[PDB]
Design a binder for these strands. Sequence first.
RNA 1: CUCUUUAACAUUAAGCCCUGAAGAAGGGC
Lengths: 428, 134, 96, 85
Amino acid sequence: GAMNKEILAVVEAVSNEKALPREKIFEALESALATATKKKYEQEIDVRVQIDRKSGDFDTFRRWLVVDEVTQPTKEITLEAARYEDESLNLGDYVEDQIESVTFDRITTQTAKQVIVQKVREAERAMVVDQFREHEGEIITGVVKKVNRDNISLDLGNNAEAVILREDMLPRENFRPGDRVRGVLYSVRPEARGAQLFVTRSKPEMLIELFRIEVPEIGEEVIEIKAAARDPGSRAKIAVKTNDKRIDPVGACVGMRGARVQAVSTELGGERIDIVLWDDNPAQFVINAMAPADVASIVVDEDKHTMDIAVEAGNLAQAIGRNGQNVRLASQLSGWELNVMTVDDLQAKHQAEAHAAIDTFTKYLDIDEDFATVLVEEGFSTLEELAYVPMKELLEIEGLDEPTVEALRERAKNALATIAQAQEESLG
Amino acid sequence: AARRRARECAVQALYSWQLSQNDIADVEYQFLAEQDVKDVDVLYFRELLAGVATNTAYLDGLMKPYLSRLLEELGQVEKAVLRIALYELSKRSDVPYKVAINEAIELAKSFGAEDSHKFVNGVLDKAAPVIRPN
Amino acid sequence: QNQRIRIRLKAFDHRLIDQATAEIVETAKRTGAQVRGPIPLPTRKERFTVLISPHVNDQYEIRTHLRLVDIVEPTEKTVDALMRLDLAAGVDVQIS
Amino acid sequence: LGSMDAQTRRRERRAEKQAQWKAANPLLVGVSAKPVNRPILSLNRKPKSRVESALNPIDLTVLAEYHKQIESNLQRIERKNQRTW
RNA sequence: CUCUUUAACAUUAAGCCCUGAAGAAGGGC
């Protein structure tokens, strides 16, 4: 057939190393060729081509996709033409037996050449990604060599390198060449012309792995850490738990008088650390992550899970902390929104929550005497939820269980339908 | 006492072996070749290094029946000394049960952290049934 | 090339020390080097002074451990491995 | 008894305005994290041991070597472009 | 010549002051 001498010299020059796959080259460039031949022919078709390493000549076959339907008559068949194959073909498999005219050109060489070097780029990047997969999420030490503005390049052995962005490093600390840096890598964003590893001391994974090296109980998988939240310069909160009840996880991580955690805090730049127990009840776990400051009143809205917290003043100021970040850490740990207030404002806040809505009820069906009473247990159900909750629940000795509930549902559902219709085609 | 003081040095060797997991001939040749302890006697020190045989594993199994915690969950540093103690208990039986065992709790005073010996002072009930001559 | 390596070890928390020592043995074993350790000395008492808020009119010593290992022959990979592992924090492993 | 937060001192100073706003409103709110913000990926790292990692360090020697090979051979195709003069 | 089966309790701090209810934003030194 055909074989551009230049391109053959190219594939034998950029020939893949023993670690690398030379075959992959042909797999790519034949896709390139076949795509070019496909672009030549006026009708949209599917086409393949194959080359052998021994010769360099290729052969181009235009093929159809056996299918049970009529779309793309240029590329479809039935099992009847597969009778030429002796019924060996099945649907969803595309085969044929007729070669097509193999294309020769010069401009293709260029783009063909491109694919070669193109694959090489991916070859570099991909070849590096292996090492990342080998050490993804682990702490590795390097020695700084460059100090670019707000990011530093670190040398690792065996021609390996890395980089730390300023967001990934401590807020206070600036580094210099020659300083050893312990750092967990966490991403490999593909820069143009290959990628390079990204390392971080600021991310929580630095802290978690920093605890893994320190507490063998986690290394022994005895105890699990369920989440970690941290403010790099200041403090951190971490939730631990074991289901064995054999040992205390917080005691295992703390060490002797804190000497096991303080050590990591020494590596973390003296960052304050709160170790708390992990809990499966959200609310209780929230209280545990709310520590050192703690409250006795908790309200939840699992529909939004934006729960609220109330507390004495002296413990209020402790609950918020500097700039609020205390709660911000707790929420950051809980993976859920939070809200803090004073208890005195809390009770009245619930009475207002119920009062405005009860003014809506009085605004719709108007029996303020009957509604305020129904409001007492309405708290579980919004005006839509009363209609959405099964009627099995709201039946009580108070009020009328059977005659009034039907009309109630009618009123509520009609009104909410009116709001839904007012969303669209409103004045403004 | 000074001869008894020899024993602990022998006690120290197996931990080495226990973590090096090498041929015992290497352990003895390198150990004595580096330095000689004039206080302890090799005449007796060498006989215990033979006791690496697994008969002492059979005796350590005797601790399994009653065990609040897993056999190997407890510190190997502290398990080694139990293999030694019961080596002398059944294979040797040189010192009586309460006399050897009180000293034994002192032995894990020497290297056991957080009163490890003191709680393991319960475990001596497991040793008593092997010899009713209390 | 400076084959007579000298290593001692301070050990404030035995739990980390057994594992740490075992790793220092595994790095020599995997490179191919063989050696004898840890040779533990008895527990050393280090008196402790504390300064808590004034009590009406506070630990003062905690148990420590100590180990020692050498190396028969460091392969070129054994120095990069020995420097390559990250010493468990809270324990001073200063080389002799 | 320092209590050296200027903004907190202002809070105690402006406490009456806070009381004026206290009625019939949310008092404080606190949102944090996000799914895209809270992926942590910490399921399993013990297979990689500090011995294994120290014994099998991150090696990219073959990549740089191969790279130099490529660049040399490309300069050789520019030698194909080159003429003897 | 028994002491009745192995600690865990860790955080000392980030200026002054203004607009703003805000511990949201934002400012002067």
